[PDB]
Structure formats: C-alpha cells, structure tokens
Design a protein around this ligand. Structure first.
Ligand SMILES: CC(=O)SCCNC(=O)CCNC(=O)[C@H](O)C(C)(C)COP(=O)(O)OP(=O)(O)OC[C@H]1O[C@@H](n2cnc3c(N)ncnc32)[C@H](O)[C@@H]1OP(=O)(O)O
Ligand SMILES: CC(=O)SCCNC(=O)CCNC(=O)[C@H](O)C(C)(C)COP(=O)(O)OP(=O)(O)OC[C@H]1O[C@@H](n2cnc3c(N)ncnc32)[C@H](O)[C@@H]1OP(=O)(O)O
Ligand SMILES: [Cl-]
Ligand SMILES: [Cl-]
Ligand code: NI
Lengths: 159, 159
C-alpha cells in the first residue's frame, strides 16, 4: 500500500466527492440523518464549490487542498483555509476502510509542513462533540479544546 | 445502532458469506492476494460447509456460531469449535465499517459466557502474524501467545 500526498487538481473532483460522501455517511451515522448528509454533500461538496477551492489551492492563495492517494486512487483529503498568519482545518476525511492506518496523521503532517513554510503558527478547527473518532484523533495529535460553538468543539493547535 | 447477538440460523447463510468476503478482502489486503482470498471464500465459506456448521451449532453440538445484528442486518460473527472441555476460536470477523466499536468484544463475551455455562476452561486460536488488527484485539482481550504454526501465532486464554 503506497500512499502519496499531493495537491488536488480539477481531475480529482469526481472521486473527491465520492470519498467525502462515503466518509460522511460513516462518520455521522449516529449524528445526522441520511438526508441531512445527502443534502450536505449536495450543497457543500458541489462540483462548483470544490472546483473553485481546488483552484484557489492550486493557485497558492487561501486554500490548501491535499489528497492521499493509494496506488493512484484518491482515498482521503485535507483542506485548510488561510487568513493572515492563521489556519483553519476545514476538512479531513478518509474512506472508512482506510482509517486507523496513520493516513490522517500523514495528511496533517504535510499541511503542517506547508504552514511552517508559510509562517503560519496557529491552526484551529471545529469538531462535532459526538464525533469521537475525529475528536480523539485531534487531541491525540496536539489539538486542545479552547471553546464551543453550537454542537461543535473549537480546538486549536499552536506552533 | 442496536446490536443483537444470537445463534445464526440457515437463513443467515447468504449474508454470512458476504460479511466474510468483505471482512476478508479488508483484513488481508497486505497479506494474501485477491485471488487467494476469493478462493478461500469459495472453498472454506461455501454454502454447504457453513450450512453444516450452522446446523451443528443450532443442534448444540461441536459448533457455536453467533452473529451480531445491527438493526436486523448481520454485520459480524464468531464461530467456536468444541472438543471435550476446550475450545478453538475458529472465526471472528466484522464488516470493516463496523470495527473498533466493541462489537468484536461483545461477540467474544457472549461466547465466553456460553463456554462458562458449558464448563469450557481453555480457549485457543490461530492468528496470522501480520494481522495486527486481529492480533492486537486478542492480546488486548487476555489472549497470550504460546506457540507458532507456519505464518500463524497460536494464542491461548484460560478461565
Ligand atoms: C475539522 C474536521 O474535518 S472534523 C472531521 C474529522 N474527520 C472524521 O471524523 C472523518 C472520519 N475519520 C477519519 O477520516 C479519520 O479517522 C481521521 C482523519 C479522523 C483520522 O485519520 P486516521 O489515519 O484514521 O488516524 P490515525 O491512524 O492517524 O490515528 C489513529 C487514532 O485516530 C482515531 N481513529 C482513527 N480511525 C479510527 C476508527 N476507525 N475508529 C475509531 N477511532 C479511530 C483513534 O483515536 C486512533 O487512536 P487509537 O489508536 O488510540 O485508537
Ligand atoms: C481466529 C481469527 O478469527 S483471526 C481473524 C480476526 N479477525 C480479523 O482480523 C478481521 C478484521 N477485524 C475485525 O473484524 C475486528 O477488528 C475484530 C473482530 C478483530 C475486533 O473487533 P472490534 O469490535 O473491531 O474491536 P474492539 O472495538 O472490541 O477493540 C478495539 C481494539 O481492536 C483493534 N481494532 C479494532 N478495529 C480496528 C481497526 N479498524 N484498525 C486497527 N485496529 C483495530 C485495536 O487493537 C483496538 O484497540 P485500540 O482502541 O487500542 O486501537
Ligand atoms: Cl465533525
Ligand atoms: Cl488472521
Ligand atoms: Ni484504535
């Protein structure tokens, strides 16, 4: 199992949406309803929005959008948003069958490496409080809860 | 997510084979080849063999064959073989998306409960040495390595 991390490109769009869908159905099985998720996928992970995000990342602006590829097949992705010297980890998702193999850790390290290249010293995120899979991974990797907003925990990491 | 543990019945056959297939492809992705697995599924998990095993379990003889059912859908199974006062854990497999939720632990506890009812004080198993997922679960649950046979570790638990 060879895993490559690289910036996503527009050709990654269609399988990106499928990874997102598959990871979302799994991750939130006890949190949101099947329809809530299908609408979320349709509205937030639309072809147009992701394309624009993939482009802003490729153009080296306010998005960093990396995928993990297993034998050329996209199986995970991370997306950060940069404003000034700070980042927000918007998204980190893998195909459920590819979890617990350090692939999430690998995407995070890559982003962190690029943030350090960019002078970004703070990174923060919003995680649904009932998402133990995600929440536990984050605190195991140096994120600390600093606040809440609705159902989410606001976690933050400094460098 | 409601999980029920009960003895398998002949009507469980077709979805039993699919769980086995899906768990096998995942579990041994870096261990055996796609064909080795498809042959193993075809030859060891055949309709006839499993049926006979399900029957011997239902008849209360030398097999104990339990499934874990999530909302009426079979998602995992355990199978033990009894000879005298001792057992061998032949099989324990879940759909990959259902792992890491204590469902494996739940099947093991059920079998252990029945073994104790039956006076069975020793339980042993063979785990492929490169199966870290399975091997780690077993030692986290009181199994200790006592020997090897080919690629497998022979692990054993006493009560
Ligand atoms: C800001 C946001 O994007 S929030 C949404 C975060 N993403 C999700 O929840 C989607 C579902 N999960 C995933 O995609 C992944 O598990 C990630 C990205 C959260 C973590 O990546 P992975 O490569 O799976 O994790 P990695 O192998 O580095 O670390 C393992 C740890 O993560 C957590 N974890 C990873 N996979 C699993 C799993 N299948 N079941 C339970 N916990 C898991 C555990 O805490 C585990 O620690 P343990 O060994 O003590 O049990
Ligand atoms: C004799 C034989 O049958 S050998 C074949 C054994 N079965 C397999 O390997 C098939 C693949 N795996 C599985 O079906 C299951 O993981 C089982 C049956 C081994 C364990 O059942 P689960 O309900 O998943 O495990 P449970 O939640 O009780 O325990 C979690 C522990 O099991 C292991 N584990 C369970 N799921 C995973 C996973 N997706 N990735 C990595 N490790 C895992 C870990 O050691 C975990 O401990 P951690 O929290 O420290 O990481
Ligand atoms: Cl979340
Ligand atoms: Cl094994
Ligand atoms: Ni774990």
């Amino acid at each position: 199992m060879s895993i490559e991390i690289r910036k996503l490109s527009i050709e990654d769009l269609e399988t990106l949406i499928e990874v997102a869908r598959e990871s979302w159905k799994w991750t939130y099985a006890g949190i949101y309803s099947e329809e809530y998720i299908e609408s979320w996928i349709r509205e937030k992970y639309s072809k147009e929005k992701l394309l624009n995000e993939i482009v802003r990342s490729q153009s080296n602006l306010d998005i960093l959008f990396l995928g993990a590829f297993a034998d050329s097949t996209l199986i995970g992705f991370i997306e950060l948003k940069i404003i000034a010297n700070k980042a927000e980890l918007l998204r980190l998702y893998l195909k459920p069958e590819y979890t617990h193999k350090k692939i999430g850790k690998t995407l995070l390290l890559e982003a962190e490496k690029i943030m350090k290249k960019k002078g970004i010293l703070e990174c923060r995120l919003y995680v649904h409080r009932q998402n133990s899979v995600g929440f536990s991974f984050y605190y195991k990797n140096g994120f600390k809860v600093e606040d809440t907003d609705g159902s989410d925990f606001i976690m933050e990491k400094k460098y």
